[PDB]
Amino acid sequence: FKHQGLVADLLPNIRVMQGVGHFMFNYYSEGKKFPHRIYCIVTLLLLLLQYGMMAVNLMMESDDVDDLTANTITMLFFLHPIVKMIYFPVRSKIFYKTLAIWNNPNSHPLFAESNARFHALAITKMRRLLFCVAGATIFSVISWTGITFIEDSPIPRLMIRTFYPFNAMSGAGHVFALIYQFYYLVISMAVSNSLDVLFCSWLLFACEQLQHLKAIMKPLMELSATGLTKKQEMLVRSAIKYWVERHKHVVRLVTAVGDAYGVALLLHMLTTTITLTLLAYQATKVNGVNVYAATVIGYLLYTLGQVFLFCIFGNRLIEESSSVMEAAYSCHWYDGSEEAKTFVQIVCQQCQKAMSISGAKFFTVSLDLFASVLGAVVTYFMVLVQLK
Amino acid sequence: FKHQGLVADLLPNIRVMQGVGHFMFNYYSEGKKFPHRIYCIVTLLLLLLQYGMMAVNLMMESDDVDDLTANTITMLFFLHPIVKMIYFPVRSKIFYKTLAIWNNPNSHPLFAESNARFHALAITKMRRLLFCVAGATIFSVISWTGITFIEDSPIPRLMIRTFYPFNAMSGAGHVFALIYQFYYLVISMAVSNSLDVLFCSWLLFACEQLQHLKAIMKPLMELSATGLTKKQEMLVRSAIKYWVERHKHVVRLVTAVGDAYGVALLLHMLTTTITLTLLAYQATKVNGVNVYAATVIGYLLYTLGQVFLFCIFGNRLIEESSSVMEAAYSCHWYDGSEEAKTFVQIVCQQCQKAMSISGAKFFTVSLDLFASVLGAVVTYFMVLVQLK
Amino acid sequence: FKHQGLVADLLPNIRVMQGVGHFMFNYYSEGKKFPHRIYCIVTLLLLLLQYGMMAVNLMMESDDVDDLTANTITMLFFLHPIVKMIYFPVRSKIFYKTLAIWNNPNSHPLFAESNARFHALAITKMRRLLFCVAGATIFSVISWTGITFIEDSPIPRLMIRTFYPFNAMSGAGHVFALIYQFYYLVISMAVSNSLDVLFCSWLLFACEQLQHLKAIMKPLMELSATGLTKKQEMLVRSAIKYWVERHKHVVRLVTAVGDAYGVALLLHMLTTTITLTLLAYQATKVNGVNVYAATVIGYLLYTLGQVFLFCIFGNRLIEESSSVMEAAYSCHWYDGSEEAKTFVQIVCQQCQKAMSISGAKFFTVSLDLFASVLGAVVTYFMVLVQLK
Amino acid sequence: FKHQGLVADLLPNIRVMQGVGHFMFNYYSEGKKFPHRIYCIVTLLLLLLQYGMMAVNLMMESDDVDDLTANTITMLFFLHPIVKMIYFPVRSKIFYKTLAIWNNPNSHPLFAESNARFHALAITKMRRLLFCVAGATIFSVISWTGITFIEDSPIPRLMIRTFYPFNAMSGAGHVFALIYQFYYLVISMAVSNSLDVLFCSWLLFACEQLQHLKAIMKPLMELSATGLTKKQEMLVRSAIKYWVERHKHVVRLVTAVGDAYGVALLLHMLTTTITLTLLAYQATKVNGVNVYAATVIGYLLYTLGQVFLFCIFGNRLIEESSSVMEAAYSCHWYDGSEEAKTFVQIVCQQCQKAMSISGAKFFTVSLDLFASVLGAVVTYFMVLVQLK
């Protein structure tokens, strides 16, 4: 019913995730699971049918090299929301571990006045992100429908080019197919982007949790200043005990969200690299502003956009985590107590190796990663231009 | 009238910036703004007219591939002083925040003898840089005029090749156009290079401000040596309080000049990367020492020169900031007081992660950046040589 | 007879190494060496005969470019278990130094309860690794035999294509040659993979030895808490003396296993780089799922697999060594003694520069190395695709 | 006469440098300078004559592309010992500053027993390096003479192909030219390799000076152990005062040898990069083991060999400098005094950012640099192979 913590913070982000069809069966009533567990199986069956009918487009239209690569991208495009659809139930218990990692937070009595200032500050931006991302997908849902109706070639007028046992270019009952594909395209581009935001709202939680843990440092250090009674040294030790055990706890979250989502982040990034080395071939044969250009750009602005969504709040984690060392400096430690000065020396030794999300331990999700991926495309592109 | 700090330090660099036409409306009399605000609007109109007439050169001469790329560079060349012209009023309040960040500096009574030694040392080199850079642009203003008069092809004898509603190859009244383009070329290559120096004089201020903060460390540490009276421990704490709050304040500047100029540094560096992947195509078709070679080199020695201007004093920031850790070592801390020894342990923990100017958080402006950009050109060049 | 330490831990891994034919003459009875030293010489003679007969295949079939590169890889494939066969007796004394580095471990009286918990935990996973790797080679032994019998071209039906003074395509007594090559292929792919696991079990020993040294840190720090008697400060200093001298000792191991195996790791990695720039040429001419594709993939899944075997437990060393700094934090140091707090400040200064295995000081064996090698192949491949 | 320090250590390396013709006029009698200063001018005149006659070979044989690139390398090969010939007198005062940086070393009374153990240990290996390098050049002097006499083409039988106002293919008095070129080739390959060793013996001095400063750390820390009298705390502070002021002094050397030689190291490395992108073109047209192959390999094994000579003892500096942090750990600091424990915390904070030789602040001379240069050649080669 009620939720003991971080689950009560991502309540819009979880209902969408369960509503779109991720096999997320633990944050509502047990007297709703069995009608919902059947819903999740049939959506994946509706996913795997339509995605299965793209291969018979792809395999039968294998004689054209351009229609090979065109259908290759579209099948690799929708290869993300299949893997994330299946990554969630397979790597499942660690997801519930991360969502339940916050259900006993640390708290300090008179100085939680900055806890709730940044607690609800997270919940806005965690809900603000979901309203930005999933709304942009619904925009990109419309942005593939509107391009469908403004071009023809003879081809069947379809949202996604795929074979059917019935007809579409001659059967006028293909309005069933378009509403099927519109449902497919709105469920795929949400069920991928639902799970990505769940990762990307976790890091937004810990970033503002660190941003909380920045601003304690100046009122913490004024406690140890002045020749101190024992009630101060009891209070400043209980102030440190809050601060470190909060900071231990954020590390406990971020090493878990790198453990939960970390392997799927690789499979996401491994897919886009195969995707972008085909977009760059499609980006060669753009002879002008056409319907075709809005399909090459229409993927590349979105397939970079999935990478850019990670690499912002992956960077914002690293930018925030190193910034604690700068913020531990900008307190008046030079007239703190000696137990407070030895506190800062340790903190700046461990806010110095920043918290990064290891993408299955190959790469950290920095924005320099996105600078590397974007640079790798243009390098492969402007080589492939001169090799054309 | 008078200026409370850092604005009084960049007084040559600001008058040139207001004189050339940046919309900088806050460092002179209010009874001069309205004749000056009209001057700034009409210069941008004179910028946008001439730059607008280059597209009608570019779009109408689109059938030639070489004259495509030749006019592409020249339009991308002058795309810098349009963006910096508009970056300043848009991202405006942070510029005035950085220039007013110094108007209450920290000061220590008997040991400001090294403050003014490095205060006026900055003001020389900040004025020495402006006399070097803007003079080199005036040299490069002449260096595009002299090459104009030593070649012809039939073409209109113009400083910058562009269409006009009137004639130049047949109208002998095109001396109006050349004086218009000479004004255009002298205002563009200054209004870009004015704002770049403003960034690049900020870092020169903080570098010599750190170089000041190096040389305090040996006389600071002699205060804590020897068994100390309270008037020493009051004085050495007030010596530390000066040192850290100065060092907090330089960090407060450098995190602001990375916040003020940081996005435009990306747009500058994103433009030159598109520029240098066209210079390298022009660098292929150099069959000998000609007028043409002094146009390919005439851009590449300048377009690298804009990058090299950032990457020196970007590097000099990082070389200076890490050097505080070496200079905090080379004081006699081994016979300082214990509050002085715990001072050095903290300082070397935060002079260890050096202050770098993040170019909109993608890249730091190191000289290794300039080593990477220069290496990326020659790699693209000597691939494009073998692909020709 | 009995073994004083780490040799008694790798007892399956040593008997296989002596059994396969490495010149390892020091961990059994002296009344078994002389029948064993003759065995080691004749196996290398059986290695060098068969490998010598591949050059006369290679040199005589030099007119075909494809059969050049096909036999080039196979000779470069089996160039690993020749070099490792000869690396062991040449660089020999350092191997016995590393295996005898543990024969006087450090021990603390009441807190060795976590020593044997991680001592035998290593010995499982060190024996679990050998049962995985050498079993996978026996799988890959069968995986080159089964592909032999499912293809023909006229060619002699051979496991490895090589010339013989007698005949195989016409002499039906070539069953002697196949049993010779089956012995050759099972001894080569073990005598390389035996020595690799010896390196790769050392790092697994120190990783779980560090994982031991993680978990001391919370019970260590509870000793210094509370106003302490001298018997505590004697005990906490003897607790630190165990911890650092253990940590000095693991460093003493890892700087030795980077000194023992480090040069051969270069020669291994230098060989695969020459190998992978030929696999990528073979990976071009794959026109479909054939017998040929299972030879290109059959090497590339194994030649990357040798690199991937190092780069996991090379990474797991670096991931473990930096993790001590995180684990030295997550003890209650904020109410430890002052001698305990100054302990943590030093430890996090040297768990910060992680222990890495320098591959003859060029490269560290990270998993980012394997990310670089895998990225270098596909880059060379998908350039060579467009240059075909 | 006698020399006050480090000059008395490089006495073989200086006499060779003055003997070969570097304008080094300060380490012998004033009653020998004027006959020696004329010797230095005429050698450079003999250098600039022969090098000047290579351009008239190069410019007149410009119609052949292969003989362009062949003579281009040879002129770029001998472009090193011209620049280093002129780098020494131009950047001169800093060279004498580095050689006189050691003439007042720090010394501690009873614990200089490890000073002279590593003082004379340097002087061996500094003289051992000179006997290795300059002997290898004399080998490479012979290695270009022996290849001269084993090939002909009609061409004049010359050591280095160059024009003369007199004849060589028809004038049998060209034995004067060969003895001139043999003198030229033995003076060029020494006067470059003399100055390189001077840099590369400085780093060898500081490496063994750090290796000295490693081994003090265990006997230093036993002084502070145990409750200490004032004569101990006076002695341990005087032990620290020796250690840091030695370590400050090595930093004072290494920041000077990066300031003295640092710009010429760039010009050396900038030349070889232009050289290696021509060797790789020559490395393409090697059709077999010939006289020609021993000229392509005969430069590439030497032009990499100049880079490899820096990058070993550049790496050995960085490997040694970071190793102080490991060696400051492996003393018994856990029962040192508190002034000794706060010593180690500072040392490991500044042996953590290693001392590197900045090649005019672009690149550090690591062995990863040599790994990058060697990787850049083969990448450019095996691209240029597939583009042939």
JSON list of N, CA, C and O in Angstrom, two decimals, chain D residues 279 296-306:
[
{"chain": "D", "resi": 279, "resn": "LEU", "atom": "N", "xyz": [58.95, 6.65, -43.39]},
{"chain": "D", "resi": 279, "resn": "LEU", "atom": "CA", "xyz": [59.42, 5.27, -43.27]},
{"chain": "D", "resi": 279, "resn": "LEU", "atom": "C", "xyz": [58.32, 4.29, -43.59]},
{"chain": "D", "resi": 279, "resn": "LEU", "atom": "O", "xyz": [58.57, 3.27, -44.24]},
{"chain": "D", "resi": 296, "resn": "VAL", "atom": "N", "xyz": [65.40, 0.61, -44.80]},
{"chain": "D", "resi": 296, "resn": "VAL", "atom": "CA", "xyz": [64.14, 0.96, -44.16]},
{"chain": "D", "resi": 296, "resn": "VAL", "atom": "C", "xyz": [64.17, 0.53, -42.70]},
{"chain": "D", "resi": 296, "resn": "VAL", "atom": "O", "xyz": [63.87, 1.32, -41.80]},
{"chain": "D", "resi": 297, "resn": "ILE", "atom": "N", "xyz": [64.54, -0.72, -42.45]},
{"chain": "D", "resi": 297, "resn": "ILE", "atom": "CA", "xyz": [64.72, -1.17, -41.08]},
{"chain": "D", "resi": 297, "resn": "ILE", "atom": "C", "xyz": [65.90, -0.46, -40.45]},
{"chain": "D", "resi": 297, "resn": "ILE", "atom": "O", "xyz": [65.88, -0.15, -39.26]},
{"chain": "D", "resi": 298, "resn": "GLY", "atom": "N", "xyz": [66.92, -0.12, -41.24]},
{"chain": "D", "resi": 298, "resn": "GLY", "atom": "CA", "xyz": [68.09, 0.53, -40.71]},
{"chain": "D", "resi": 298, "resn": "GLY", "atom": "C", "xyz": [67.85, 1.93, -40.19]},
{"chain": "D", "resi": 298, "resn": "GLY", "atom": "O", "xyz": [68.67, 2.45, -39.42]},
{"chain": "D", "resi": 299, "resn": "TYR", "atom": "N", "xyz": [66.76, 2.56, -40.59]},
{"chain": "D", "resi": 299, "resn": "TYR", "atom": "CA", "xyz": [66.36, 3.82, -39.99]},
{"chain": "D", "resi": 299, "resn": "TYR", "atom": "C", "xyz": [65.33, 3.61, -38.91]},
{"chain": "D", "resi": 299, "resn": "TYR", "atom": "O", "xyz": [65.43, 4.20, -37.83]},
{"chain": "D", "resi": 300, "resn": "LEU", "atom": "N", "xyz": [64.36, 2.74, -39.18]},
{"chain": "D", "resi": 300, "resn": "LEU", "atom": "CA", "xyz": [63.23, 2.57, -38.28]},
{"chain": "D", "resi": 300, "resn": "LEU", "atom": "C", "xyz": [63.66, 1.89, -36.99]},
{"chain": "D", "resi": 300, "resn": "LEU", "atom": "O", "xyz": [63.06, 2.14, -35.95]},
{"chain": "D", "resi": 301, "resn": "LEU", "atom": "N", "xyz": [64.68, 1.05, -37.03]},
{"chain": "D", "resi": 301, "resn": "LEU", "atom": "CA", "xyz": [65.20, 0.49, -35.80]},
{"chain": "D", "resi": 301, "resn": "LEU", "atom": "C", "xyz": [66.02, 1.52, -35.04]},
{"chain": "D", "resi": 301, "resn": "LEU", "atom": "O", "xyz": [66.21, 1.39, -33.83]},
{"chain": "D", "resi": 302, "resn": "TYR", "atom": "N", "xyz": [66.47, 2.57, -35.72]},
{"chain": "D", "resi": 302, "resn": "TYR", "atom": "CA", "xyz": [67.23, 3.63, -35.07]},
{"chain": "D", "resi": 302, "resn": "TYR", "atom": "C", "xyz": [66.37, 4.83, -34.74]},
{"chain": "D", "resi": 302, "resn": "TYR", "atom": "O", "xyz": [66.61, 5.49, -33.73]},
{"chain": "D", "resi": 303, "resn": "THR", "atom": "N", "xyz": [65.38, 5.15, -35.57]},
{"chain": "D", "resi": 303, "resn": "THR", "atom": "CA", "xyz": [64.57, 6.32, -35.30]},
{"chain": "D", "resi": 303, "resn": "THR", "atom": "C", "xyz": [63.55, 6.03, -34.20]},
{"chain": "D", "resi": 303, "resn": "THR", "atom": "O", "xyz": [63.24, 6.91, -33.40]},
{"chain": "D", "resi": 304, "resn": "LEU", "atom": "N", "xyz": [63.04, 4.80, -34.15]},
{"chain": "D", "resi": 304, "resn": "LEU", "atom": "CA", "xyz": [62.37, 4.37, -32.93]},
{"chain": "D", "resi": 304, "resn": "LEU", "atom": "C", "xyz": [63.36, 4.26, -31.78]},
{"chain": "D", "resi": 304, "resn": "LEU", "atom": "O", "xyz": [62.98, 4.47, -30.63]},
{"chain": "D", "resi": 305, "resn": "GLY", "atom": "N", "xyz": [64.62, 3.95, -32.08]},
{"chain": "D", "resi": 305, "resn": "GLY", "atom": "CA", "xyz": [65.60, 3.77, -31.03]},
{"chain": "D", "resi": 305, "resn": "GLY", "atom": "C", "xyz": [65.96, 5.06, -30.32]},
{"chain": "D", "resi": 305, "resn": "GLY", "atom": "O", "xyz": [66.32, 5.03, -29.14]},
{"chain": "D", "resi": 306, "resn": "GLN", "atom": "N", "xyz": [65.85, 6.19, -31.01]},
{"chain": "D", "resi": 306, "resn": "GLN", "atom": "CA", "xyz": [66.02, 7.47, -30.33]},
{"chain": "D", "resi": 306, "resn": "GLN", "atom": "C", "xyz": [64.85, 7.75, -29.41]},
{"chain": "D", "resi": 306, "resn": "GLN", "atom": "O", "xyz": [65.03, 8.24, -28.29]}
]
